[PDB]
Design an enzyme around this catalytic site. Sequence first.
Site, mmCIF file in Angstrom:
data_model
loop_
_atom_site.group_PDB
_atom_site.id
_atom_site.type_symbol
_atom_site.label_atom_id
_atom_site.label_comp_id
_atom_site.label_asym_id
_atom_site.label_seq_id
_atom_site.Cartn_x
_atom_site.Cartn_y
_atom_site.Cartn_z
ATOM 1 N N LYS A 173 1.799 -3.303 9.154
ATOM 2 C CA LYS A 173 2.962 -2.408 9.143
ATOM 3 C C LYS A 173 4.204 -3.267 9.388
ATOM 4 O O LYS A 173 4.209 -4.070 10.326
ATOM 5 C CB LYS A 173 2.847 -1.328 10.236
ATOM 6 C CG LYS A 173 1.754 -0.292 9.986
ATOM 7 C CD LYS A 173 1.702 0.784 11.076
ATOM 8 C CE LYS A 173 2.675 1.918 10.845
ATOM 9 N NZ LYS A 173 2.540 2.981 11.877
ATOM 10 N N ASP A 230 -2.155 14.831 15.254
ATOM 11 C CA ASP A 230 -2.432 14.912 13.815
ATOM 12 C C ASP A 230 -3.860 14.485 13.449
ATOM 13 O O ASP A 230 -4.072 13.716 12.501
ATOM 14 C CB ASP A 230 -1.342 14.172 12.998
ATOM 15 C CG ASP A 230 -1.273 14.522 11.515
ATOM 16 O OD1 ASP A 230 -1.976 15.462 11.088
ATOM 17 O OD2 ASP A 230 -0.529 13.843 10.783
ATOM 18 N N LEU A 242 0.798 -1.229 0.000
ATOM 19 C CA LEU A 242 0.000 0.000 0.000
ATOM 20 C C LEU A 242 0.832 1.281 0.000
ATOM 21 O O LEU A 242 0.372 2.301 -0.517
ATOM 22 C CB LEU A 242 -1.050 0.004 1.134
ATOM 23 C CG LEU A 242 -2.046 -1.176 1.181
ATOM 24 C CD1 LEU A 242 -2.908 -1.110 2.426
ATOM 25 C CD2 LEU A 242 -2.932 -1.237 -0.068
ATOM 26 N N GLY A 243 2.040 1.217 0.559
ATOM 27 C CA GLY A 243 2.950 2.355 0.621
ATOM 28 C C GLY A 243 4.102 2.198 1.592
ATOM 29 O O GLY A 243 4.386 1.090 2.056
ATOM 30 N N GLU A 244 4.785 3.320 1.890
ATOM 31 C CA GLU A 244 5.928 3.382 2.806
ATOM 32 C C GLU A 244 5.782 4.558 3.767
ATOM 33 O O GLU A 244 5.690 4.362 4.977
ATOM 34 C CB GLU A 244 7.255 3.489 2.033
ATOM 35 C CG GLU A 244 7.656 2.215 1.309
ATOM 36 C CD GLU A 244 9.126 2.079 0.961
ATOM 37 O OE1 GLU A 244 9.976 2.266 1.862
ATOM 38 O OE2 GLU A 244 9.427 1.722 -0.202
ATOM 39 N N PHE A 302 9.208 2.142 11.502
ATOM 40 C CA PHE A 302 9.176 2.777 10.188
ATOM 41 C C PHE A 302 9.484 1.769 9.079
ATOM 42 O O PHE A 302 10.450 1.009 9.187
ATOM 43 C CB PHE A 302 10.151 3.964 10.140
ATOM 44 C CG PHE A 302 9.689 5.102 9.262
ATOM 45 C CD1 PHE A 302 8.796 6.055 9.741
ATOM 46 C CD2 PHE A 302 10.156 5.230 7.960
ATOM 47 C CE1 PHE A 302 8.373 7.110 8.930
ATOM 48 C CE2 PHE A 302 9.727 6.285 7.146
ATOM 49 C CZ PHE A 302 8.838 7.217 7.637
ATOM 50 N N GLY A 303 8.648 1.764 8.039
ATOM 51 C CA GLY A 303 8.783 0.850 6.908
ATOM 52 C C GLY A 303 7.584 0.807 5.982
ATOM 53 O O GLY A 303 6.871 1.802 5.834
ATOM 54 N N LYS A 304 7.357 -0.359 5.351
ATOM 55 C CA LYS A 304 6.272 -0.591 4.389
ATOM 56 C C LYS A 304 4.926 -0.942 5.038
ATOM 57 O O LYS A 304 4.886 -1.442 6.166
ATOM 58 C CB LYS A 304 6.673 -1.680 3.377
ATOM 59 C CG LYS A 304 7.850 -1.311 2.486
ATOM 60 C CD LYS A 304 8.208 -2.440 1.532
ATOM 61 C CE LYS A 304 9.159 -1.987 0.453
ATOM 62 N NZ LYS A 304 9.403 -3.060 -0.546
ATOM 63 N N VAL A 305 3.823 -0.677 4.309
ATOM 64 C CA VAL A 305 2.445 -0.974 4.721
ATOM 65 C C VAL A 305 1.836 -1.912 3.677
ATOM 66 O O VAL A 305 1.972 -1.655 2.478
ATOM 67 C CB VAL A 305 1.573 0.301 4.925
ATOM 68 C CG1 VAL A 305 0.159 -0.059 5.384
ATOM 69 C CG2 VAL A 305 2.220 1.269 5.912
ATOM 70 N N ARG A 315 -7.950 12.746 6.839
ATOM 71 C CA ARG A 315 -6.987 11.833 6.190
ATOM 72 C C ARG A 315 -6.507 10.747 7.182
ATOM 73 O O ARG A 315 -6.086 9.669 6.756
ATOM 74 C CB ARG A 315 -5.789 12.601 5.592
ATOM 75 C CG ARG A 315 -4.887 13.272 6.626
ATOM 76 C CD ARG A 315 -3.727 14.065 6.046
ATOM 77 N NE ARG A 315 -3.084 14.818 7.122
ATOM 78 C CZ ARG A 315 -3.480 16.018 7.532
ATOM 79 N NH1 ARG A 315 -4.457 16.653 6.900
ATOM 80 N NH2 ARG A 315 -2.899 16.593 8.574
ATOM 81 N N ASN A 316 -6.563 11.053 8.504
ATOM 82 C CA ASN A 316 -6.150 10.162 9.587
ATOM 83 C C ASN A 316 -7.317 9.469 10.314
ATOM 84 O O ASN A 316 -7.187 9.054 11.470
ATOM 85 C CB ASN A 316 -5.165 10.867 10.524
ATOM 86 C CG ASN A 316 -3.860 11.185 9.830
ATOM 87 O OD1 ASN A 316 -3.430 10.481 8.904
ATOM 88 N ND2 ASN A 316 -3.209 12.254 10.246
ATOM 89 N N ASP A 376 -4.539 5.549 11.231
ATOM 90 C CA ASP A 376 -3.708 5.749 10.041
ATOM 91 C C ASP A 376 -2.487 4.838 10.125
ATOM 92 O O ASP A 376 -2.160 4.349 11.213
ATOM 93 C CB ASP A 376 -3.296 7.225 9.863
ATOM 94 C CG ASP A 376 -2.250 7.694 10.853
ATOM 95 O OD1 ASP A 376 -2.636 8.146 11.954
ATOM 96 O OD2 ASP A 376 -1.042 7.565 10.546
#
Length: 289
Positions: A43, A143, A21-23, A24-27, A147-148, A161
């Site tokens: 995650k 935050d 889905l995207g990029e 502590f690391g990748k999703v 979006r979150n 998120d």
Amino acid sequence: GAMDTFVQHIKRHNIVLKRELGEFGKVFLAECYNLCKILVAVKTLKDASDNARKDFHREAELLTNLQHEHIVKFYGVCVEGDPLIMVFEYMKHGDLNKFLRAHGPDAVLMPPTELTQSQMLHIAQQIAAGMVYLASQHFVHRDLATRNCLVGENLLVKIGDFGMSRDVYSTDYYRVGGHTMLPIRWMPPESIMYRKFTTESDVWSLGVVLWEIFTYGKQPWYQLSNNEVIECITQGRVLQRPRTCPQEVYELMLGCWQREPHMRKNIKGIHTLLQNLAKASPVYLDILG
């Protein structure tokens, strides 16, 4: 309950990775077995330092007992081999900002159904319910924005998120003092000027979230540059009343926007009002994507 204090560990073979889905690391989007198979959002943490793996377990211990109807569900972790995996529920309808924009007058005109005032109140009360819970646990979000937030089935909304917002929604962040990427359009004066984040700065952000909902996800202060946004917030100018917003809801937003943090409306009072308004204007019409 008391058992939720202890982190649930998941077997590696029970997780089937499906989509990055995207990029502590990748999703990733994945399937999870022997959990109750279900779709999950995961995650990953690849070849991290001793301190970074320590931070991972520390985060898992926080998330395991931060449980509520309106907070994204945390299922557990897999630490068998590399990468380390954190498992969450998969909210079918994605982020709330995308959802709001998909049901806006522009999206209908280009069909999807236009989001109703009753549906807006239902979304609002759920986020406020989640915020009452976070405040009760002395958790400061920092935050809060649509979006979150995430959307599931039957217009179910939860705060959550996967740490991709600063990349996916880059325009919503400003490099305060040339040092930290911060969501200025959702922040009160003390957070922008002194980097003070509290339950009270989260209340200001909730006011901005209400503006987003009633405007079909439009960016707050869209007419202004980042410097002009700061000038308005610090000087006492306010966001306009959205056309679809009931007067009592706009007055609730104004109460979130008091310059003095201790003068802002309390989270419990905000939720009680939104809950009462939502019950008086319930959701019943068909919703089309």
